[PDB]
Every structure is written in structure tokens, then in C-alpha cells.
Amino acid sequence: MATVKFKYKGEEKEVDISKIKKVWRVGKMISFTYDEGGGKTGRGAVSEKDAPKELLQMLEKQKK
DNA sequence: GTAATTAC
DNA sequence: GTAATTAC
């Protein structure tokens, strides 16, 4: 699994792959939802080249 | 503006 | 309804 580093609203974030819920491709970017504790869902996206192999396996296994 | 999808 | 993400 590992982790994913991204930027969201002027803030640089890092998130555990195990906390990622939904993954999808939009053009050439990979967008996703993740669990940020409590009942809250977060959002994020990275460039294809920056996506860990584990995030890419979740995508292909999902693609929804 | 557009893409896919979401949180709020 | 809208703003948020990368790359044209």
C-alpha cells in the first residue's frame, strides 16, 4: 500500500493508501476519496506519473 | 471549458 | 450549485 503525497487547497498532504476509498481517472489525473478520521471523507488527486503502483492497482480493480 | 466525481 | 483536483 504505502502512502500518497498530494496538494489540496494550498496545503501539501500525505495519506495512507489503506485509507483510500474510491479511485478514478479523469483525463490524465487520478482523483480519489479517502478516510480522514471520524466520519469525514476527504478528496485528492495526483498526476498519473506520481501515483504509487498500489493506487493504480486499486484503480484498475475498481474503475467506477 | 473539459474530463469524473465528490464534499458541503 | 459550486469549488476542487491535472493537463491540455
Swiss-Prot record:
Enzyme Commission code: 3.1.27.-
UniProt keyword annotations, A-Z: ADP-ribosylation, DNA-binding, Endonuclease, Hydrolase, Methylation, Nuclease
Top-level EC class: hydrolase
PTM statement from Swiss-Prot or TrEMBL: Lys-5 and Lys-7 were found to be 60% monomethylated.
GO MF, any single term: RNA endonuclease activity
Pfam families the UniProt entry points to: 7kD_DNA_binding
Modified residues (N6-methyllysine): 5, 7
Protein family membership: Belongs to the 7 kDa DNA-binding/endoribonuclease P2 family.
Subunit structure: Homodimer.
The protein's role, per its UniProt record: Can constrain negative DNA supercoils. May be involved in maintaining the integrity of the genome at high temperature. Has RNA endonuclease activity with a narrow substrate specificity; the cleavage products are 3'-phosphooligonucleotides.
Name of the protein: DNA-binding protein 7a
